[PDB]
Amino acid sequence: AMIIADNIKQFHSIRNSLIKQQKIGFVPTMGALHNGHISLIKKAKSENDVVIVSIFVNPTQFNNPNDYQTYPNQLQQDIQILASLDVDVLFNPSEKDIYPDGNLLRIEPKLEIANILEGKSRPGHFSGMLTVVLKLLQITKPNNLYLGEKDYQQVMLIKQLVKDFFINTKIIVCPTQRQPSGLPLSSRNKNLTSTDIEIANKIYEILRQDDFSNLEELTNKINSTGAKLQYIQKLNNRIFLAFYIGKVRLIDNFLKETGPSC
Amino acid sequence: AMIIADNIKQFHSIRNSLIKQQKIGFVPTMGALHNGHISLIKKAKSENDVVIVSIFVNPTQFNNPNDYQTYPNQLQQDIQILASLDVDVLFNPSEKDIYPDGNLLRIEPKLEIANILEGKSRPGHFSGMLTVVLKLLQITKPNNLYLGEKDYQQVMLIKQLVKDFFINTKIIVCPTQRQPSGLPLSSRNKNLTSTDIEIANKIYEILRQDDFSNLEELTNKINSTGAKLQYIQKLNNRIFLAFYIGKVRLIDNFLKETGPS
Numbered sequence: 358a359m360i361i362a363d364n365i366k367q368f369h370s371i372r373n374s375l376i377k378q379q380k381i382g383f384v385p386t387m388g389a390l391h392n393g394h395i396s397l398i399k400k401a402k403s404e405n406d407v408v409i410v411s412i413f414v415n416p417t418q419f420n421n422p423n424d425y426q427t428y429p430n431q432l433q434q435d436i437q438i439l440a441s442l443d444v445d446v447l448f449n450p451s452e453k454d455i456y457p458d459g460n461l462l463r464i465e466p467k468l469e470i471a472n473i474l475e476g477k478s479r480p481g482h483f484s485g486m487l488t489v490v491l492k493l494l495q496i497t498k499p500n501n502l503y504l505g506e507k508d509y510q511q512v513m514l515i516k517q518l519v520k521d522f523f524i525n526t527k528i529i530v531c532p533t534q535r536q537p538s539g540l541p542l543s544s545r546n547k548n549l550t551s552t553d554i555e556i557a558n559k560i561y562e563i564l565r566q567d568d569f570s571n572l573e574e575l576t577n578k579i580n581s582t583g584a585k586l587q588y589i590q591k592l593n594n595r596i597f598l599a600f601y602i603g604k605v606r607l608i609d610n611f612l613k614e615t616g617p618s619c
Numbered sequence: 620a621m622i623i624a625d626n627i628k629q630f631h632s633i634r635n636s637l638i639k640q641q642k643i644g645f646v647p648t649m650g651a652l653h654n655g656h657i658s659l660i661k662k663a664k665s666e667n668d669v670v671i672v673s674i675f676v677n678p679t680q681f682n683n684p685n686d687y688q689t690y691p692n693q694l695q696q697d698i699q700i701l702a703s704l705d706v707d708v709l710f711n712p713s714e715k716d717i718y719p720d721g722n723l724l725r726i727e728p729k730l731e732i733a734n735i736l737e738g739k740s741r742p743g744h745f746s747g748m749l750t751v752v753l754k755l756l757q758i759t760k761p762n763n764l765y766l767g768e769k770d771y772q773q774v775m776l777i778k779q780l781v782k783d784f785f786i787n788t789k790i791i792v793c794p795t796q797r798q799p800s801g802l803p804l805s806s807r808n809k810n811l812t813s814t815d816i817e818i819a820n821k822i823y824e825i826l827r828q829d830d831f832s833n834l835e836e837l838t839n840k841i842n843s844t845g846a847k848l849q850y851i852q853k854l855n856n857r858i859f860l861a862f863y864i865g866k867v868r869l870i871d872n873f874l875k876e877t878g879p880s
C-alpha cells in the first residue's frame with residue numbers, strides 16, 4: 358500500500374494529488390531507522406491523515422568525508438520498517454534530484470547558536486542541513502514537521518528557517534529516545550564495536566551520577582573510560598557534549614536537573 | 620481601488636482571498652518608480668488577473684552605506700503611479716516585517732557568475748538580493764515574476780533560485796528601457812545633477828559609436844568625460860559595464876552587435 362517515490366517527478370505527482378483538507382505530516386531522515394525515528398513517525402501518524410517520510414543521505418552537511426562513506430545503509434530494512442508503520446509515502450530521492458546543478462545556492466547561518474557546539478565542531482554541517490531541509494520543505498509542503506530533540510541546535514535553526522522564509526509549517530519536537538543506560542539511539546552507533554558499547558555505558562553511568570558542577574573533573578572521568586571528549590558545556594539549564602569512541606562520533610544534550618533520564 | 624498592504628498580516632489577508640483560478644503577477648521593486656518599472660507592470664497587467672507590486676528598499680543588499688542612505692524615496696508618487704496603472708495590490712513592508720530577527724539566515728551564492736562583474740564589484744549584494752527575493756516569493760507566491768534585462772546576472776541568479784528551491788513561478792525577462800541617448804533608466808539617476816546628466820549622455824554618445832574591439836581605448840574615452848569607469852567586459856555575446864558619475868553608480872549591459880540601441 359505504501360507509495361515509494363524514487364525521484365522528484367513521481368513525488369510531485371503524488372503530492373499534487375492531495376487536497377487541501379488532508380493534514381500532511383513530514384518526517385525527514387537519512388535512513389537507518391531506529392526507535393528514535395519510529396517515535397517521530399508514530400507521533401506523525403496520530404496527528405495527520407498523510408505521513409511522508411524522506412530518506413536522503415545529504416552529502417553537503419558532512420564536514421568529514423569518511424563519515425559520509427561509512428554512514429549506515431539499510432534501505433530494504435527501512436522500507437520494511439516504514440511499511441510496518443503504515444507510512445503513506447516514502448520519498449527516497451537521489452543526489453541529482455535534490456542538487457540538479459550541485460550545491461550552488463546555500464543557506465548560511467550567521468547567528469550565535471550556529472557558531473558554538475556542533476557548529477564549531479562541524480564546519481559547514483549546518484549550512485548543508487539547512488539547505489536540504491528548505492529544499493525538502495519546498496518539495497513536500499507539509500502541514501506538520503517532526504524533529505527529534507537529540508539535535509537541539511538543528512531544531513532551533515530549522516525553527517528560524519521556517520520563520521524567516523515564511524513556511525506555513527508547524528514544528529513538533531519530540532523527546533530523545535534512549536537506551537536503558539541513557540545512551541541516545543543513533544544510526545552511527547551501528548558502527549560501535551562490542552567493547553565500544555561497554556565504554557558508552559560507562560560514560561552514562563558517570564553522567565547519571567554527576568551533578569555537572571565541575572565540568573573539568575567530569576571531562577577527566579569521561580576520558581578515563583577510553584573515549585575522547587570533544588566538548589562539554591552548559592547552556593541554559595541544558596548540558597551539551599560530544600565525544601569519540603573509536604572511529605564513532607557521539608553527541609548528546611539533556612536537561613541539567615534530569616540528566617540522561619528515561 | 621488599490622489595496623496597500625504595509626505589513627505581512629495585512630498581505631496574507633488579501634493573498635489568501637484569491638482563487639487558484641486567478642493568475643498572479645509579481646513585480647518586485649525598491650520604489651522610485653520610473654518608466655522601466657512601468658513597462659514591467661504593464662507587461663504583468665497584460666498577462667495576469669492580479670498584479671502585485673512590492674516596494675521595499677532592501678538594506679541587506681546595499682554594500683555601500685552612503686548608497687543606502689541616499690537611495691531615492693518617493694512613496695506618495697509611487698502610490699499615485701501604481702494607482703494610475705490599476706495595480707491590484709501594493710506590498711510596502713517594513714524592515715521588521717521582512718527581517719523579524721535580523722539578517723540571520725542568508726542565501727550564499729557559490730557560483731561562477733556571482734563572482735564576476737557586479738558580484739566582484741559589490742560584495743554581499745547578491746546574497747542580500749537572493750535572500751529578500753526568496754522571502755518575497757514565499758510571501759506573495761505568484762505564477763509570474765517580471766524582471767528587467769538591465770540586471771542580467773540578477774536575472775540568471777533568480778532563475779537558479781527558483782529552480783533550486785522548487786518555486787512554481789514563471790520568470791519573464793523584459794527589455795531595458797532607455798533614454799533617447801541610450802542611457803538606461805535607473806532609480807539612482809534621480810541623484811544625478813544637471814551636469815551629471817550631460818556626462819552620461821556623452822558616455823552613451825561614445826558607446827553608440829564603438830565596436831568594442833578595444834575596451835582599453837573605450838575606457839579612456841569614458842574616463843575623459845569626467846566619469847569613472849569601474850569595469851567593462853565581454854561576457855559571451857554581451858558587453859557589461861559599470862561606472863561612477865559623482866557618487867552615483869551606473870550599470871548597463873547590451874549585445875555587442877547592437878549596443879545601447
Ligand SMILES: C[S@@+](CC[C@H](N)C(=O)[O-])C[C@H]1O[C@@H](n2cnc3c(N)ncnc32)[C@H](O)[C@@H]1O
Nearest residue numbers: 385386387393504505507508532533534541542
Ligand atoms: C537521522 S536524523 C538526520 C536528518 C538530517 N539532518 C536531515 O537532512 O534532515 C533524522 C531525524 O531523526 C531524529 N532523531 C535521531 N535520533 C533520535 C533519537 N534518538 N530520538 C528522537 N529523535 C531522533 C533527528 O532529530 C532528526 O530529526
Ligand SMILES: C[S@@+](CC[C@H](N)C(=O)[O-])C[C@H]1O[C@@H](n2cnc3c(N)ncnc32)[C@H](O)[C@@H]1O
Nearest residue numbers: 647648649655766767769770794795796803804
Ligand atoms: C528598483 S529595481 C531593484 C530590485 C531589487 N534588486 C529587489 O528586487 O530587491 C526593480 C526592478 O526594476 C528593473 N529595472 C530597473 N531599471 C530598468 C530599466 N531601465 N528597464 C527595465 N527594467 C528596469 C530591474 O530589472 C528590477 O527587476
